[PDB]
Design a protein around this ligand. Sequence first.
Ligand SMILES: Cc1cc2nc3c(=O)[nH]c(=O)nc-3n(C[C@H](O)[C@H](O)[C@H](O)COP(=O)(O)OP(=O)(O)OC[C@H]3O[C@@H](n4cnc5c(N)ncnc54)[C@H](O)[C@@H]3O)c2cc1C
Ligand code: HEC
Ligand code: HEC
Ligand code: HEC
Ligand code: F3S
Lengths: 136, 413, 540
Amino acid sequence: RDSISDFMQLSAFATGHKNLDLNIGSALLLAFEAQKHDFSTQIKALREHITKNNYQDVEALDAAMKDDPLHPTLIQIIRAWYSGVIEDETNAKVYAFEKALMYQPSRDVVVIPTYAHNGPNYWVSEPASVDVMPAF
Amino acid sequence: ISRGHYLAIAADCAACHTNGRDGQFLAGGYAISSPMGNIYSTNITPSKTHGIGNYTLEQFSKALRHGIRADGAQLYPAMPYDAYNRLTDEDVKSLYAYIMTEVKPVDAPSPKTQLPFPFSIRASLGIWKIAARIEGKPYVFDHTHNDDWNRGRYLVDELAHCGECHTPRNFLLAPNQSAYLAGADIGSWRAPNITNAPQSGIGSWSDQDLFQYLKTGKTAHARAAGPMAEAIEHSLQYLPDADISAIVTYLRSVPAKAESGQTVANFEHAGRPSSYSVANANSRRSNSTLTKTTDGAALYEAVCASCHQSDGKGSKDGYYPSLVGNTTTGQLNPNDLIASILYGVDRTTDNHEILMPAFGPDSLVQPLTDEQIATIADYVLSHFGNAQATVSADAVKQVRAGGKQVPLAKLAS
Amino acid sequence: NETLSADVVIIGAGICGSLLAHKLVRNGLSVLLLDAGPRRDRSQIVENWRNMPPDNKSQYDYATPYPSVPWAPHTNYFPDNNYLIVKGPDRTAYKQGIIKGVGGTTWHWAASSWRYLPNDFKLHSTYGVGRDYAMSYDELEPYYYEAECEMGVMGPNGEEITPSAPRQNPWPMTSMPYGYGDRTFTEIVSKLGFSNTPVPQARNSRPYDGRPQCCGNNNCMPICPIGAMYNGVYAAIKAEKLGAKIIPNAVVYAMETDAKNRITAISFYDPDKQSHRVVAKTFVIAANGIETPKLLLLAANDRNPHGIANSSDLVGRNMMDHPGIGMSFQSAEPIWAGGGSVQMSSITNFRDGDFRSEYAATQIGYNNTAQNSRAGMKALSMGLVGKKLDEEIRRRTAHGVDIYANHEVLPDPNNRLVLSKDYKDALGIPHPEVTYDVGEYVRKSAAISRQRLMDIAKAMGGTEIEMTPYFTPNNHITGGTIMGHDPRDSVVDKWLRTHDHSNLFLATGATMAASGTVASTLTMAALSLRAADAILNDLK
Ligand SMILES: Cc1cc2nc3c(=O)[nH]c(=O)nc-3n(C[C@H](O)[C@H](O)[C@H](O)COP(=O)(O)OP(=O)(O)OC[C@H]3O[C@@H](n4cnc5c(N)ncnc54)[C@H](O)[C@@H]3O)c2cc1C
Ligand code: HEC
Ligand code: HEC
Ligand code: HEC
Ligand code: F3S
């Protein structure tokens, strides 16, 4: 629990989005510890860094950790939370879809491929502008 | 348009005397799946050879209200003459004029209904008619209420014959008047309770909601399906607005009738914020022709996540209905839900066609086994609508067979 | 299995075989569809695609939802099973994908049903290049229309778009409205002088057949979870409903000919490599443009040592396809791909002309598949973080544009389909091997289509301009079974009947004596039903 709670806290800080599914988090952490045994030590170290340096957002945290050994793990957990996958092969396990974070910033216009948007004829309307962040 | 044409449109005589989209209109030949079997509608066009062109006014009124043909035989109750008996003489002569003067004769015999013994002979029907208490004084203006109340009663009981399906039938398949507008199983489908009961019936429905339901069949809480699909797409969508207002006015005044095990209105059920696990189908990759995916959530997302979202609230624009807080899923009896899963929904209103695909064995989208219906309906019922009901393999297989078999049908063995 | 005897045995239970079986069983005959693969479910293909890692959603991978069976292997070009060895300097042009099962490749096809021009049937009579068909388009018109009605195809009913295929009775649907991107492409290339036209899509703009209308899931590639587009499974189960027999897991490998060269029986293997024999009055192959010549060469009898219907040495020869070059880039203005279907528009201005005597005519089309997965993957590619990650995701999914340009290839006998002498499968069948040469015709055509793509990129102002040096696979398996009147220079006649075997018809993709310039599966369906009528005349 404590590992998973700190896991969802670190993911909320790294992604910058407070609304994250808990099952997706628990499952992603399970796959993460499956891939490397020492993921818990790395996440405690990363939380320690963000707390001690008092990093407000993940942007300054990434800027100040461009060369430290804990950059790859943060980048890869962000990759797993967004893309929903961890590996780079065509047979990797997909752990979250329709809730993966890449499909959210373009959710209102771009339809999630297997879930229908509003109505059978929505695309008759003009789309939203690209310079506005909708939500999430 | 003419008074007779409007009266026929209101009475919905076209839906049951037309054999689908083809089968030129008012030539009959359309089969009703009565408990005894298929009852074929007769051709009503004024054809002198094969039609009813030789019919005169007295015989037409007799066939319309008391169920006797020109030859003298009785008409099967599948004709709603028990409720059609109460139109006034002006209305019956208006329908006479509409039939002989406004519909083209067509020279094509309709199929003859062949009923199993002892229902093969259509002569014992007089005993059922006298036992059913059909007669039947023609309608008169009740002066206790306003004009709209009487007009709504006229459409409900005389023209639209709501009690033909919304009033349960007794042992003799006669209208059990005591539970007036309380719903009944009419085969694979079930007409629900529509009385003024705030929980069992439509008493809690807003007036605009009932008006939209009666004019289009599409609203945020209920969608007309099956028998309402045909009834609305054939009778009510062309019917003028004031008569819809009279209808809702009367439905707001009918006495209440409670159903067993109801606590909230059928459209007042909250949804469980639960979904499937995406990871579980990773074990199901490279695994075509699904038979192993037995979990309710996995099947639900496999077939039903596209239209009704994983949250079960449907489309934003409303074309895909909100399964949460919907009467079909919120009814205690899943016969509406099971029938919706089995046959889909097809309703053509203003030449615009609602259609949700069937998921029976003859589906073209995804023909899926009966156990899959049962598990899917169980998940839908528990998570999004009324969680107090259950759906089993036997119930869905029964509805596939054509609804529960009435005891009388066993006499034909 | 003792005999599985029938009036007609027709092989390949795809759209070809399913439509053939439905038309034949609608006339009251005995029909045996066979297919090399098992059954599949739409919902399971949907879920398999649902859990497939988005890296293969970035680069278009449509197959892994559909499993591959060891006895009947189908082509996969993400990590390759080496099923289809292709050689020649233009080898990459022939990396054609297929699926084996109840529905075939048509299980996952983009629903671009098209009509050929009459000139496409008389190219050598019109330009002195290519080859002429055994018949004309007016002969095939009513068959083509009945296929359009059967599948439930949308089309641009009233528009004088370009000189194109004439129609006699109009289209049983109206095309669904464009998405934003299709409108933008149309206007910008109307400014560019290119004529963009709607694609005719075998989908539901309104409920029909009992299937709801398209929801714009933009996942026609590979599979819709709604059944709003046509699939061969529809005709398959429809034929099954009328009493026709289907058999999964039936891999044909041999056949027998009597003294009159008429086919008495053929022999297939089940997954357990059990040989079962089937005997029928009529024998017809409707499998694929690669599978059919494979079967023909595989069972070369003593009467036909070189191969079945190969007396002219033209089985698998003259291999046709559309050499394509596909492009991806980032638009200056938002393009917003993902609205509606997966293909809605294409440029058809260059589908014909007097230039055809020198170089090939080309079709420039656009992919309407959602760029959201590609955008997310490319945004994560340089490891960008925070809000900037979402901004980059949004700009990449709003500015990603995907084009392609296909050509027309002339019949080359050297374009061959030798059976591999080095690779084999679970049943021991020699795996297919092709050797493709694109030809100076298509080289000259590409020399101009490339300029056209440079102009299409420049006028709209794309960034990250990516160009492949090779030809992309357009998966139109035509040629190998050429039509004609002379038995010494062809295999089958205008009624699809083989010259060597009067009992053998070939309703396959390889039938087309020319590849044309556009999609050609609806031509294939028209041919299949023409063969159905020929079988009707033969047996009645
Ligand atoms: C990525 C892609 C995009 C495409 N886009 C388009 C497009 O836009 N427009 C268009 O018109 N077309 C397009 N196509 C082509 C189209 O999808 C197919 O060519 C079409 O389905 C025709 O296939 P078929 O019916 O001939 O074969 P299929 O239906 O695929 O196969 C028939 C069956 O034959 C069986 N079989 C094969 N060999 C044997 C054997 N030896 N013994 C027994 N059974 C056997 C197999 O089991 C198979 O199921 C595309 C194809 C691909 C791959
Ligand atoms: C005369 C015009 C009426 C009126 C006012 C109503 N009915 Fe019907 N109806 C039928 C069936 C099978 C259903 C249930 C569909 C399902 O289970 O999904 C309905 C539904 C309704 C409602 C909705 C109320 C609800 O609880 O969902 C209402 C308000 C309603 N009806 C009123 C079938 C029939 C008929 C079959 C022959 C007949 C006639 C009518 N209905 C007539 C009427
Ligand atoms: C589908 C329900 C239904 C409705 C609604 C309906 N009918 Fe019929 N009708 C029937 C059936 C069923 C029969 C035959 C029943 C029998 O033989 O016992 C019949 C028989 C008749 C007959 C006898 C003709 C013959 O040859 O048997 C007449 C006349 C007739 N209907 C007129 C009407 C009129 C007028 C209306 C007003 C629109 C109407 N019906 C509405 C179903 C219906
Ligand atoms: C996009 C095709 C589609 C599919 C697939 C689909 N639905 Fe629906 N469904 C609809 C539409 C559209 C309606 C309402 C029709 C209208 O408003 O015109 C509807 C209505 C319903 C109704 C009846 C609502 C009412 O008031 O009568 C139920 C119950 C339902 N859906 C549940 C399901 C379930 C459970 C599944 C999956 C097993 C499913 N649907 C699959 C589109 C679909
Ligand atoms: S995925 Fe389906 S909803 Fe339409 S866009 Fe393709 S047929």
